[PDB]
Amino acid sequence: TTALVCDNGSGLVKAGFAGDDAPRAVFPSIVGRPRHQGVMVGMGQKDSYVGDEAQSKRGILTLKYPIEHGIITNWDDMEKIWHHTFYNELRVAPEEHPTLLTEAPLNPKANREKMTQIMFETFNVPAMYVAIQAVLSLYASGRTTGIVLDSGDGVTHNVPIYEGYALPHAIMRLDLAGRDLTDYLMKILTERGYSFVTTAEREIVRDIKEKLCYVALDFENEMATAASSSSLEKSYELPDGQVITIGNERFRCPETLFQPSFIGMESAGIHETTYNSIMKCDIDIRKDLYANNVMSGGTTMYPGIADRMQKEITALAPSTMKIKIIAPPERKYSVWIGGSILASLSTFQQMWITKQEYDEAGPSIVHRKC
Amino acid sequence: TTALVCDNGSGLVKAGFAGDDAPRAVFPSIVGRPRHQGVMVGMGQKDSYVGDEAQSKRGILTLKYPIEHGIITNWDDMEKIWHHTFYNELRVAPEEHPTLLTEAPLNPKANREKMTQIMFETFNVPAMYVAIQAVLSLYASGRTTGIVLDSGDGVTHNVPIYEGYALPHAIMRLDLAGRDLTDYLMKILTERGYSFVTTAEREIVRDIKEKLCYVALDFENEMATAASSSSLEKSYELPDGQVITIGNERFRCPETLFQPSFIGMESAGIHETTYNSIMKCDIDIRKDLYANNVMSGGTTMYPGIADRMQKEITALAPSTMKIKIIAPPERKYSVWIGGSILASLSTFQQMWITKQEYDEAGPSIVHRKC
Amino acid sequence: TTALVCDNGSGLVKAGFAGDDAPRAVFPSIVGRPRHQGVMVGMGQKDSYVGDEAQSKRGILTLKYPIEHGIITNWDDMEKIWHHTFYNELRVAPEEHPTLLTEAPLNPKANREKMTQIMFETFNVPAMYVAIQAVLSLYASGRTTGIVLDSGDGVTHNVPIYEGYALPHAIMRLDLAGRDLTDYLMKILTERGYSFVTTAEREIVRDIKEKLCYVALDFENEMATAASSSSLEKSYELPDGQVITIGNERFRCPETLFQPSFIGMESAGIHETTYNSIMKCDIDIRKDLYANNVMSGGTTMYPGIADRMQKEITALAPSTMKIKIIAPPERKYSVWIGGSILASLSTFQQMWITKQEYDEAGPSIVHRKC
Ligand SMILES: Nc1ncnc2c1ncn2[C@@H]1O[C@H](COP(=O)(O)OP(=O)(O)O)[C@@H](O)[C@H]1O
Ligand SMILES: Nc1ncnc2c1ncn2[C@@H]1O[C@H](COP(=O)(O)OP(=O)(O)O)[C@@H](O)[C@H]1O
Ligand SMILES: Nc1ncnc2c1ncn2[C@@H]1O[C@H](COP(=O)(O)OP(=O)(O)O)[C@@H](O)[C@H]1O
Ligand SMILES: [Mg+2]
Ligand SMILES: [Mg+2]
Ligand SMILES: [Mg+2]
């Protein structure tokens, strides 16, 4: 009778059971299909690969992400992803496990309705629920009041909560996250002569970004430092043994979070978005929001991002405001951890969307229960 | 109901039954016709000789190869060859044996279509199939990943397969193989005063090449070694008792595979062709191609060719790539062995081109079934 | 005091003086070196040939292209090319002529820096400038708004400009162009029995492609038409008098621009790349980009390419968008014509990189002036 927690991000699936501290399985949410011709008979050559097996065979596949900026764009591939999650990774039967799902705020309603319908009809779950990922990150923190910035592969969002009450008019959503940083790193890696163009070579660039990239405390000083000397240059070995070297692409890629105009966007950086979200809240709750800046997600995992956020929000806010950025070492899984905490609570047990409620009230049950 | 496997190379016919480990018969694919005048009545003096009987009587015949660089140029002589194979060597009736045939990649389509037509009309086979020889060579080695370098009398070709998927854009074909090496050995044997000019004397030079020639690990060092001393000189006894001696023609002949400019070709050597074929494949599959270099065919049978290929590809590839050359002792028949393995599989039984498909869909069935 | 305009493409050099309507000289950017042995004394047998003289003597040379996908890979041969351009074709002294050079977008920075250094040190130009070829193509058409699809021997690129402002985040670059089409035509010409393998025979195949190839309005219909009848077959006479015939290779070769998977690439066709470039631009500027599709370069010179681009972009775009493809009859020289127009303007005269700026600011002047 244990509940399931599935955190469907744009880039990774974090799935497990409620009551744990880490997910069962964490695998990329990709579906790969062969793009060359098979010449050997049989071999169990399947027509599509999901998750880690698609990354294993990615040299002969075309990798597709069913989720795009927090929105599911391919629903057959997403059913493939969910079937993989339930049967090959969790190795469970979804007929007896309530499933907690997550979603970004300010998302299309059809996304939520269709997840509800697929859970209740394709996978026959007894109950389900869709929770906002930033509220779950606050549950993982253990703090009732915080402003949460969640940055994932697809979306960056700010949700300010005070005493357990959210201020939905102050919620920010920015469609700039890890995948845009990967694409920008590809583009600026072309400057040194490195050409990554295929979907399989997007994973190599994502690995380069996760290993070698960091957030500069002061961008212009680091640009001058990289110009003067090669102290910031690091090498990376490609899957075929070729070695690439990057000097200032290491901090130019994550700078797009603070200067979105690098990729041609008109928006403000994550620091200015956070400050604007705080300033749309009530004046009496702003001090507690300044002191509680919870960062979650994999795009907040850069070395130096918390210090840079500290510096920028301190510059924006008054001098008597006491700015703290809470960046737990496990913030790459804060949404899943908070979802496990929430699904394990006794008070939450009356808040599931039951199967009978779905049957006798339609998929639109999800907008008024969640 | 057993299937036939006929490997028609430019130089030799390898024919047998599926399920065996070696072909029934291996004979030269030559048709000899007398060039002098008959003076004795009768004797069963036939107008043409095929296979081993043409080599037996080659002193009074003009030997012709119906296949030239993997392409059948004389179709009447090729029907003679196939009739010999079926009736005098296999001693079977082709009306009840499906026949698996082999062909080099990047070959004229008319070649394949006309083999299909002759099999289905002249020999009345119940079914047939044309397979690429490098895929068959990969079947024999028992693996589904690797780049195959197949060298025969007529063509040398590279086909990279990964997980059973071929990359047809990375397939190389080089029209330099054993027959070009035989001709070059004739030409450079003229340097010591030995004149072989006739088609029958081409077989003597081919025998010299198969017995005395080897691949030098370092060409310039071996050239210096042969210049300094006579330690590399070996003798060969001609059919009439004359003894010839060759010192550096032993490794100068096979060096044409690595330096095609010896015979006036502009192409790259087999090592550089293999490296170029690997580098036209996806970056994620290159490590497994480096570690799996399958060599098949009779022109890869030189002493020291695998070590030289190891050395050259190691020089071309990065230092962290782990280069292996797989050169089985039976690689002179890898194509036939793999064809037997393929024709014996149960999954392949639905992939034959049946007689009815040919009748009601034309000879062009072979491009979309094979 | 007239300025020079040198359009260095991967395949051809277009050089001339600013203010003209056509370049002085258009010759292949190849350097040929003899591959056989000289037996006649003297003759002025030079060790290397550049341009038209290499194509004249290509039967005894190995032709090398110093530019490869818009990137200069051999710099000594490129200095040979530039010296030829300046002294044997333009017959000028570069010490008193500012030189305008062109480059593809998303190119290595070392390419631009080394062209700047060689111009300012080897050829002693008073000033120089490197311009993006698509902006120059937009100069030639006399408009300041439109998305340019420039296809050359080495690179195909999309650059959307609106009101004179470029959107660098929407710039596409595809490393598929005329040379890849020539190689594909060689590969599929092997199907009818025609074997072109040498670098000199690459020019014959390029001539065949330029004379006999066209873009099919509907590929499958043309494939059916070529299968049914021989109405699409045309003959071509080789330099030695042999006549070759091609039926569907005529439109199968240029189809690789719309189906890059023909040569094993994962990218999208030029139509889908153009649509994707338009859709990464602001919603308010998309109507003017749809109506202004400037095509330039020699690979856009196929019969029927503009109509096919019209059809495909119309299929992709909404029905109320008004799609025009602007394909001037002189679009093979749009980059050079636009460069001449730009170098002749009075406003541009303050935008040269002067010699003193180079001397006292390094070769890195080119990234912040251009
Ligand atoms: N150590 C790291 N440094 C920088 N970026 C990272 C790191 N680890 C993961 N990422 C990025 O975070 C993204 C995945 O974060 P995640 O929270 O799983 O997103 P989602 O919730 O959308 O799945 C990926 O795009 C990856 O590039
Ligand atoms: N031991 C050997 N050493 C060198 N060359 C050999 C040897 N044995 C055979 N060959 C060459 O290999 C060629 C035959 O190889 P094979 O694989 O039968 O070619 P094909 O498939 O074209 O018939 C002949 O030209 C012969 O000269
Ligand atoms: N009439 C034509 N039809 C098709 N292709 C052509 C034609 N004329 C030239 N080309 C191709 O265009 C390329 C040269 O175009 P160009 O604009 O000069 O390129 P670059 O700017 O790279 O020199 C050559 O590869 C040639 O094959
Ligand atoms: Mg997330
Ligand atoms: Mg063979
Ligand atoms: Mg050009």
Residue numbers in the entry:
A (entry chain D), B (entry chain F), C (entry chain E): 5 to 374
Recite the paper's sentences.
The transitioning of cells between migration and adhesion is modulated by α-catenin, which links cell junctions and the plasma membrane to the actin cytoskeleton. Outside cell junctions, α-catenin dimerizes and links the plasma membrane to F-actin. α-Catenin is highly dynamic and functions either as a monomer or dimer. Here we report the much higher resolution (2.8 Å) cryoEM structure of human dimeric α-catenin bound to F-actin and the 2.7 Å cryoEM structure of F-actin.
To determine the effects of α-catenin binding on the structure of F-actin, we determined the 2.7 Å cryoEM structure of F-actin from the same grid and data set that resulted in our F-actin cryoEM structure bound to α-catenin. Therefore, this comparison is directly indicative of any alterations in F-actin resulting from α-catenin binding versus using other F-actin structures derived from a separate actin batch that could be used for such a comparison. Superposition of the actin subunits of α-catenin bound and unbound actin displays a root mean square deviation of 0.7 Å for 2888 atoms. The smallest and most flexible of the four actin domains harbors the so-called D-loop, for DNase I binding loop (residues 40–51). This loop changes its conformation upon adenosine triphosphate hydrolysis and mediates longitudinal actin-actin interactions.
